Design a protein around this ligand. Structure first.
Ligand code: HPA
Ligand code: HPA
Lengths: 214, 214
């Protein structure tokens, strides 16, 4: 049985690629310079430097979106670097699009990979690598929640990174069954039966299915 | 054959653990805030903030040593955070202990994992994760070479992280044959013959051997 051992290895490669972004999101959320910028009152004069700082990370991670959600004086600020634009806005109450923040910050999870539509551009859905800072604000919420918004097309190129025989389909599913991206048991299907192998990705908290017959 | 597939997976786990430190070393070497501190003339008043910044990384990476080698006005500065001490010195000419720097900076390699004795404490040998910055100084050398110095005892605990049956020995060798750490072919040996499996680690550029008989 070559494929089940093959699937675990290629899943580990996806896991390694995700772990890169996870480590960078962790370091960004707990960056002493970012915390200093937050406690300074988030002065706009330093925004350019912050953007360059995020740009340096964006170039290494090769992710389209980077975000920083910070708490100062009890107010939430959402920053995003994308396509060279540094956007900023105030985090909305839980009744609005920013309820993901209240959800993640109310969870004891250090990180979640939530798929959601961009609050600056509702036309684009990304998978957001929310990582919370170790330091909490005076209101109990994480002082910083920073991470990377991954373009779904990247997820497509990264699962067809390794292809068995150049054909077949690989699929990644949410824990609720929501399909996120598309490139041992016997199943029957339209256009001849196919055999399936699936494994759970811990660092992604998502399931990976891939089918090859012949 | 369970063990050869087992060895590749556990080698990938070692590779994943190393890739964490590699990504952090890359982000640190190309940190815009570090570059700004270097071009500012490396003012001593900001050293405390720099140390806290490195401390935040050291806590996440769980590596004992962090270093920053910077070029300003044609002079090399070596900084190290270890055990809460922020040490600084001037990089010595190629005839002295700092020739590793001239070697790595003369290579076109973005990173090397060189094992060497600490220049601040010659009693302790570490494996240094030298990562060079994308920006170069006016003299042609990398503006920053930053990374983590890993305690060799960590390397020991990370190879016995996963143990087949709780016994056996795992060994990691340099490309020149220098043994770095200790926890498909038939070989004979003192105290009964043993069977060996070896694989090359790309992100570590080192070979991994592990023996189990019965
Ligand atoms: O969950 C999210 N939704 C929208 N924008 C975001 N930025 C980080 N996480 C999110
Ligand atoms: O190669 C090294 N030797 C001594 N100190 C170091 N700090 C980073 N790399 C090294």
């Amino acid at each position: 049985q070559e494929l089940p051992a093959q699937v675990k290895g290629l899943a580990a490669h996806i896991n390694l690629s995700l772990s890169q972004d996870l480590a960078i999101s962790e370091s960004l959320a707990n960056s002493y310079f970012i915390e200093q910028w937050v406690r300074e009152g988030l002065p706009e004069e330093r925004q350019n430097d912050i953007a360059a700082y995020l740009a340096r990370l964006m170039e290494q991670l090769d992710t389209e979106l980077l975000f920083i959600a910070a708490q100062h004086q009890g107010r939430g600020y959402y920053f995003q670097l994308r396509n060279g634009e540094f956007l900023q806005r105030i985090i909305q109450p839980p009744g609005s699009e920013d309820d993901w923040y209240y959800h993640f910050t109310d969870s004891d999870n250090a990180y979640e990979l939530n798929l959601d539509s961009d609050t600056f551009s509702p036309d684009d859905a990304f998978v957001y690598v929310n990582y919370r800072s170790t330091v909490n604000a005076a209101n109990g919420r994480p002082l910083v929640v920073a991470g990377a918004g991954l373009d779904l097309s990247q997820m497509a190129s990264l699962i067809d990174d390794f292809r068995l025989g150049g054909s077949g389909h690989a699929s990644l599913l949410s824990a609720e069954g929501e399909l996120l991206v598309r490139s041992v048991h016997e199943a029957t299907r339209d256009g001849q039966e196919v055999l399936v192998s699936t494994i759970w990705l811990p660092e992604l908290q998502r399931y990976l299915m891939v089918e090859v017959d012949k």
